[PDB]
Amino acid sequence: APQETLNGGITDMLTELANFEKNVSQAIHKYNAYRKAASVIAKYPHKIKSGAEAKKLPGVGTKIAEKIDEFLATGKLRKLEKIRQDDTSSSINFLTRVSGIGPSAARKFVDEGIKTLEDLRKNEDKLNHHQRIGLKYFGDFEKRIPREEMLQMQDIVLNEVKKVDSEYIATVCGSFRRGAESSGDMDVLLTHPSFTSESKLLHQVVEQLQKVHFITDTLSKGETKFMGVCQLPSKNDEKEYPHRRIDIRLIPKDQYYCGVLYFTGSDIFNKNMRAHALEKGFTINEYTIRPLGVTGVAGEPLPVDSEKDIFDYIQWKYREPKDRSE
DNA sequence: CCGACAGCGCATCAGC
DNA sequence: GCTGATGCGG
DNA sequence: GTCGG
Ligand code: NA
Ligand code: NA
Ligand code: NA
Ligand code: NA
Numbered sequence: 001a002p003q004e005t006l007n008g009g010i011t012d013m014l015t016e017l018a019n020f021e022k023n024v025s026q027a028i029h030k031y032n033a034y035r036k037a038a039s040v041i042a043k044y045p046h047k048i049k050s051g052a053e054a055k056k057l058p059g060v061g062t063k064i065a066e067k068i069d070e071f072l073a074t075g076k077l078r079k080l081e082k083i084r085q086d087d088t089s090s091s092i093n094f095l096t097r098v099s100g101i102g103p104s105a106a107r108k109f110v111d112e113g114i115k116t117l118e119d120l121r122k123n124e125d126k127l128n129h130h131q132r133i134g135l136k137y138f139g140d141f142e143k144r145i146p147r148e149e150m151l152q153m154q155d156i157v158l159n160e161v162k163k164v165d166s167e168y169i170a171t172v173c174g175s176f177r178r179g180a181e182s183s184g185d186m187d188v189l190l191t192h193p194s195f196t197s198e199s200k201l202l203h204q205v206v207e208q209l210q211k212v213h214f215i216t217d218t219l220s221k222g223e224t225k226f227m228g229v230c231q232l233p234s235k236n237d238e239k240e241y242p243h244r245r246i247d248i249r250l251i252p253k254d255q256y257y258c259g260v261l262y263f264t265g266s267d268i269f270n271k272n273m274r275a276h277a278l279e280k281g282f283t284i285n286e287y288t289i290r291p292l293g294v295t296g297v298a299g300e301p302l303p304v305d306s307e308k309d310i311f312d313y314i315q316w317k318y319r320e321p322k323d324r325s326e
Numbered sequence: 327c328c329g330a331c332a333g334c335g336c337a338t339c340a341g342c
Numbered sequence: 343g344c345t346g347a348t349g350c351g352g
Numbered sequence: 353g354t355c356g357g
Contacts, residue, residue: 099351100351101350102349102350102351103349104348104349104350105349105350130350184352185352187352219351220350220351227351227352245352247351247352263352
């Protein structure tokens with residue numbers, strides 16, 4: 001990837017515009033438009049000279065080219081400058097960094113004078129359970145997880161799961177499975193041969209991880225998906241590890257490997273895999289792969305017993321997760 | 327000109 | 343009390 | 353905001 005000094009001013013500006021569209025204007029599609037522009041620019045290996053040069057990239061349109069011309073001539077953007085100083089919009093944008101506080105909650109809080117983390121602390125009875133946990137671990141949740149800690153976390157999850165029932169299958173996916181040096185959370189996919197698409201499995205695993213005090217908190221928990229908080233144990237007289245976000249999902253055995261593939265990513269790798277998949281006559285989603293008949297009617301799901309089976313169906317050589325950046 | 331931009335589990339709200 | 347809608351997350 | 357039918 002190009003140095004963050006080639007167009008980092010431009011991609012910083014676009015990412016900031018994206019966050020205000022998401023959190024303040026509640027315009028999720030303008031959020032993704034700015035994000036998409038930021039991404040294609042951050043990959044461009046030339047220092048951008050003008051808005052017209054940028055407009056050649058896909059995702060950069062007329063209005064962003066204009067914003068780039070203004071940023072290149074002035075070193076800022078008038079609209080961005082204004083909204084930064086705006087006490088209301090800046091507080092709304094900020095409160096959404098609390099897990100569980102989205103745009104609507106952030107708006108409501110700011111409306112009634114709740115603007116800062118301190119303000120949230122004095123108003124616990126106005127916070128639901130998830131938001132109390134997001135507040136409690138605000139700084140921890142913004143920290144990244146080095147791969148070494150991820151391995152130690154995986155060690156615990158694989159051990160305790162096998163201890164519950166040795167026939168469980170558990171896979172830590174996400175960027176950690178592709179080889180990344182750091183992670184933002186832990187995403188665990190869980191299955192069991194007793195659970196197919198036509199037939200307490202999760203609770204028992206969550207309970208054991210709480211019993212050994214790995215999982216410390218619960219944001220949500222149902223029969224197929226758990227989202228919560230965990231923390232590695234600290235070495236006697238040394239600094240305690242930050243609390244971390246961990247999700248665990250129970251997925252039917254016959255849909256497991258589609259799930260593992262999908263939740264390994266990367267996002268762009270999935271798109272061209274689906275994009276390759278349909279041109280060969282197959283429809284891949286998170287759950288299943290199916291054949292697309294002459295009219296476009298997808299038939300029944302095809303049996304899948306490993307990731308490679310999916311690659312086999314669509315005439316694609318198996319690519320290792322470390323080669324799934326795209 | 328103008329619709330798509332993913333779609334789903336869980337917590338909680340809005341309505342009845 | 344239940345059913346469906348919405349907010350939120352990743 | 354951008355793409356494209
Ligand atoms: Na363009
Ligand atoms: Na956020
Ligand atoms: Na949030
Ligand atoms: Na056993």
